[PDB]
Design a protein around this ligand. Structure first.
Ligand SMILES: CO[C@H]1O[C@H](CO)[C@@H](O)[C@H](O)[C@@H]1O
Ligand SMILES: CO[C@H]1O[C@H](CO)[C@@H](O)[C@H](O)[C@@H]1O
Ligand SMILES: [Ca+2]
Ligand SMILES: [Ca+2]
Ligand SMILES: [Ca+2]
Ligand SMILES: [Ca+2]
Ligand SMILES: [Mn+2]
Ligand SMILES: [Mn+2]
Ligand SMILES: [Mn+2]
Ligand SMILES: [Mn+2]
Lengths: 237, 237, 237, 237
């Protein structure tokens, strides 16, 4: 199986599997059952922003999600990524819908990674910023129903030509190049991620959510991982 | 008086005011009596690196100092800078010598600051990087005995033409422009600082140390702040 | 007098001093009589973008102004800034109105400067990005009628509370810290500037324009430099 | 065949095919016969730096190579990359040796790319910086004799364990992710590349050289492209 570390923007409460009984953001370490969550007052139809940060000194993964003029939800968790992820990984965005749906539109996404090694100003860095997604985005690996082009945005889950979301959908987008997330002889390693999203739900409740994730290089969507599994996990264990 | 927050690379143990009995790095919040320290195996004559980081989500100030192929000293401390520093500040480097001395040479210094406000991708940033210091460095405010030019380096404390350090010296270098370190309506604020130094001590023990600090805009060297006071504090309270 | 190098977004044709007979962008070297201009199809009421670039290898100052889905105006000019500007300067934005007016609103502004000196990876850099202007913006020097705060934007020229522009107005905003624009022993020096603006003209013709400029550190608005002079030049020579 | 645009640091004069009769840097557009060259006083055994720049406004490709305290060679050439390369490409470094040899060691390599599209602050960027090359560098595609690890450096051509260069060698290193070098609806596109190298020649004359290149995504070393062809071209046409 794959190794996943993720920050979920969970819109649908699947209390049977651990979700609190309200929209929330959480930190998932190899399991859809978040190690820690925070209430999130999701706003249907409004553009929002997520900020994820981490550094090997504090060994603390934190995320902040917010909407213009509104309280922001925050969540942090102590975790040493050296003990969880392989040295090389791929970063990406994932979303899904089940019985209930929503649009999982990504307007922009940026990522920065730095590795300071045992030497004088010897830093390795990787940075990419997407504000516009073209039809043939060769530096993105699209999996499942994810597509680009429609208004220059990234649609993680399927959306009909009229613009309405589809249920039972799952999509992901990973940056093409592998990222060196940590190293034995690293003095300091850190990364920062940001993305703006538009979750619009016409029907009853919105579902199922969007997630920023880090995984093994050769990761792919687990079968039947639509709905509650957010296109990240094979089961709800 | 001034408001100081500093990370000190203390080379001389003044146990009579709280210093551990050995070279150490510490975090000073308005007092030379560190709120927290960590043992530092300073290496006479070798070039070292310091990394200081902070973000408003974790409200945790951390620092890492190291030398090539050698264990690195680390220290962290929970502190909300909103409650301690004014909204606008100046950032700088400080050093001193007392009865015993050392060179407090700075080979490079970089700083990055970011403020994410309540809006879509509305970030304000400031970044500067010095690898070479010229004789007439107009974007630096030099105080006390600090000078630039000698090999394109920054000498915080006085050094004779032959190259030997002087005792009873105090110097500082602050970036010219004020930095917006935090704001009431900020979603995320963070800064990162790095500098490489060369502490060389000919005589007995090395003293007194170097420090990265943040202060009120109009800060200047307190009288008699040579020695143990590191050019930052008026007294040892 | 001051030494000015500027890229003007000239909205009012002052043909008797050399302006082409239509809105244009031009490059001014110590004179409001542009060394080179390009027709600019200015769009009243719409937000636009300006990009200014320069590097010491090509010794070529270029600018591009554009609006979403619209042709963009471009202008370039060969000029070695070493022979025109002092080694240290300040960068800023300037605007004015005369008999006719317009709003000269700045929504964001970023600047990057790099100096590569005679050494291994010895680069000095300066970077700032403003997307939000606060009421007490301490890192900006405001001159004339320039103010910040109204929607978090920068108003270069006077605007009444109801939102209508005033005539006979002149304003400027300069970054606080001096910028090292070039150095005798520099291998490569370069800068890049970007700002989005909103020029709205209720009355007859729009006037007078906005400009990005580089000047001697102690520059201030020349008396009577409203109107055609764009708050940059003492006269029309 | 492949589409190549390259800046060559040519150490061996193959006057038979157009080379000036001395070391030189040149700009190659789909042919080893440089469209333009500049004399280069290459220095055996010393670490040097190369800076390549380009922007779609001036449509000018420039390069600067230099050594500490020494004159630097410069070369520029007007060329619209839109008319020569695919929209998507890969960037890399190439080197070779023939009868005569040299080490083609890369100490560091950084690259920055930006695409400003028809919208408000809608920039796409890619940036990577290598100062240390590890044994298993997964984000680099190594072709031919290129290897990493030896002192954390990148050896483009073969080097015996004792440290001496081999003749008849060819190697390349390309960044893993495709780069979006230009787009029909782009307001401004630009890139910047930098790398420090160490060319050491024990024998007679040094040969054959190093080159920074941009090519179609699926590019590979042309057969028999050792020596004068710098691992870039199939023949000397
Ligand atoms: C012996 O005490 C003196 O010297 C030490 C070391 O230099 C300083 O810390 C102190 O303030 C005094 O000046
Ligand atoms: C003498 O000719 C050979 O050597 C030179 C220099 O090494 C190469 O340029 C050439 O292609 C051949 O291999
Ligand atoms: Ca759920
Ligand atoms: Ca002490
Ligand atoms: Ca005019
Ligand atoms: Ca040759
Ligand atoms: Mn959940
Ligand atoms: Mn101490
Ligand atoms: Mn004009
Ligand atoms: Mn050649």
């Amino acid at each position: 199986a794959d190794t996943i570390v993720a920050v979920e923007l969970d819109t649908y409460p699947n209390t049977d599997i651990g979700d609190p009984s309200y929209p929330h953001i959480g930190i998932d370490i190899k399991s859809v059952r978040s190690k820690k969550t925070a209430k999130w007052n999701m706003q249907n139809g409004k553009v929002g922003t997520a900020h994820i940060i981490y550094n090997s000194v504090d060994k603390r993964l934190s995320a902040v999600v917010s909407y213009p003029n509104a309280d922001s939800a925050t969540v942090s968790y102590d975790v040493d990524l050296d003990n969880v992820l392989p040295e090389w990984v791929r970063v990406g965005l994932s979303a899904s819908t089940g019985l209930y749906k929503e649009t999982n539109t990504i307007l922009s996404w940026s990522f920065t990674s730095k590795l300071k090694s045992n030497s004088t100003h010897e830093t390795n860095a990787l940075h990419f910023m997407f504000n516009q997604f073209s039809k043939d985005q060769k530096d993105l690996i699209l999996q499942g129903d994810a597509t680009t082009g429609t208004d220059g945005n990234l649609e993680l889950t399927r959306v009909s030509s009229n613009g309405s979301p589809q249920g039972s959908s799952v999509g992901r987008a990973l940056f093409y190049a592998p990222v060196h997330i940590w190293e034995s002889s690293a003095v300091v390693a850190s990364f920062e991620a940001t993305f703006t999203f538009l979750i619009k739900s016409p029907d009853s409740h919105p579902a199922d959510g969007i997630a920023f994730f880090i995984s093994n290089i050769d990761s792919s969507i687990p079968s039947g991982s639509t709905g509650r599994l957010l296109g990240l996990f094979p089961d709800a264990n």
